[PDB]
Amino acid sequence: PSDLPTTWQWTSTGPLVGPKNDGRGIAGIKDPTIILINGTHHVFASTAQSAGYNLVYFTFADWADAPNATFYYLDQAPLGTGYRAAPQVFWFAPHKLWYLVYQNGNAAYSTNPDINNPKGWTAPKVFYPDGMPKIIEQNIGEGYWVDMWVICDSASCHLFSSDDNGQLYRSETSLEQFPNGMSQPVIAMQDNRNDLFEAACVYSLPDGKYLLLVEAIGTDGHRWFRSWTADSIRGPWQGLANTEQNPWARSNNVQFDGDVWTKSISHGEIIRDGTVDEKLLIDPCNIRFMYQGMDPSAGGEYNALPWRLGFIAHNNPAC
Ligand SMILES: [Ca+2]
């Protein structure tokens, strides 16, 4: 793709979004999905603690207002209590409904006619009503079925997911059938688990190509992103910036404006503006990526790690 560089450089904010002192005991705010509508950002994120995961909505105009944005917990909607994590939001234009895609042990979705109403999200329905696909059971190993992502073109809608074991899965259905009818997935891409771990993003580009981002665990133990491009959602995928020396986003290509608050660059999303619909279009000339990070000296149980959200802004746009 002509308007993407092969090497990437970023500037990061400080940690802007963390847990509230509200009695819920949340340790981390994680895995954001973010869209921008006429100056207003809308975010959904995981709440993480060792007792479980659920979902939160918040909104702000300027990024400086993110730290004080009110949290609207989606367990107050019909979406409800239970396990829910790692959301993706988009407008599905055929239905004139927003969709929120997330995991619950299966691949799930909720709908809402108005993104501004966090109480409006439906109880989950599942993309795979017969349970975990056999292909994922055969390949998951000691992993977990995570990180659900939809992208459609004008004919077909695809559902991507990971197993924390080095597979990236893809199912499809027609545009007209969505959300129903998802195929049994194929393995879209496969690597060793640390090199193709979780947190996929699949975007469309104004030149009609596609961008795939996947989170990886580096030799130093810290999270980073690898990238590929393709002419089809179905692949094949060509490496863009997918090595530690030439990463999509990693400690070695992110400059901090203040303190270096994280070494991991982990589960995030590009800010989508303009159309915020099912085609998951981005503007390659103005990429900003909301991400999660943490104090690199912290340890302990994964679910209680002190994940916070910031932004990286792309320094070297190619258009
Ligand atoms: Ca995600």
Q: What's the CA-to-centroid distance between 297 and ligand 1, angstroms?
A: 25
Residue numbers in the known binding site are: 267
Q: What's the CA-to-centroid distance between 293 and ligand 1, angstroms?
A: 14
The residues, any chain, with a CB within 8 Å of residue 61's CB and separated by 6 or more, are 39, 40, 41
Which single residue is written with the structure tokens 């696909």?
133
Q: What's the CA-to-centroid distance between 130 and ligand 1, angstroms?
A: 24
Token output for 215: 């989170």
Q: What is the resolution of this structure in A?
A: 1.4
Q: Please tell me the chain's helix, strand, coil percentages from 3-state DSSP, rounded to the nearest 5.
A: 10, 45, 50
Phi, psi (deg, nearest 5) at residue 147: 65, 70
Which single residue is written with the structure tokens 């659900």?
148
Strand order in the sheet with 238-239: 198-204, 210-217, 223-230, 238-239
Rounded to an integer, what distance in angstroms lies between the CA atom of residue 140 and that of residue 133? 11
Residue numbers in the known binding site for Ca(2+) are: 267
CATH superfamily, domain 1-319, is Glycosyl hydrolase domain; family 43 (2.115.10.20)
Q: What's the CA-to-centroid distance between 35 and ligand 1, angstroms?
A: 13
Phi, psi (deg, nearest 5) at residue 43: -125, 140
Q: What's the CA-to-centroid distance between 222 and ligand 1, angstroms?
A: 18
Give SS3 for 6. Answer: coil
Q: What's the CA-to-centroid distance between 252 and ligand 1, angstroms?
A: 22
Rounded to an integer, what distance in angstroms lies between the CA atom of residue 86 and that of residue 32? 7
Q: How many Å from the N-terminal Cα to the C-terminal Cα in the chain? A: 11
Which single residue is written with the structure tokens 């603690």?
49
Q: How far is CA 100 from the centre of its chain?
A: 12
Closest CA to 270 of 195, 196, 170, 200: 200
Query: Determination method here?
Result: X-ray
Q: What does DSSP assign to residue 243?
A: S
Q: What's the CA-to-centroid distance between 299 and ligand 1, angstroms?
A: 23
The residues, any chain, with a CB within 8 Å of residue 62's CB and separated by 6 or more, are none
Q: What does DSSP assign to residue 139?
A: H
Rounded to an integer, what distance in angstroms lies between the CA atom of residue 39 and that of residue 62? 8
Q: What's the CA-to-centroid distance between 137 and ligand 1, angstroms?
A: 22
CA distances from 256 to 91, 253, 295, 310, 313 (A): 33, 10, 14, 11, 11
Token output for 266: 């982990």
Q: What's the CA-to-centroid distance between 2 and ligand 1, angstroms?
A: 26
Token output for 69: 């944005």
Q: What's the CA-to-centroid distance between 201 and ligand 1, angstroms?
A: 7
Q: What's the CA-to-centroid distance between 202 and ligand 1, angstroms?
A: 10
Q: What's the CA-to-centroid distance between 188 and ligand 1, angstroms?
A: 17
C-beta of residue 229 within 8 angstroms of C-beta of residue 242: no
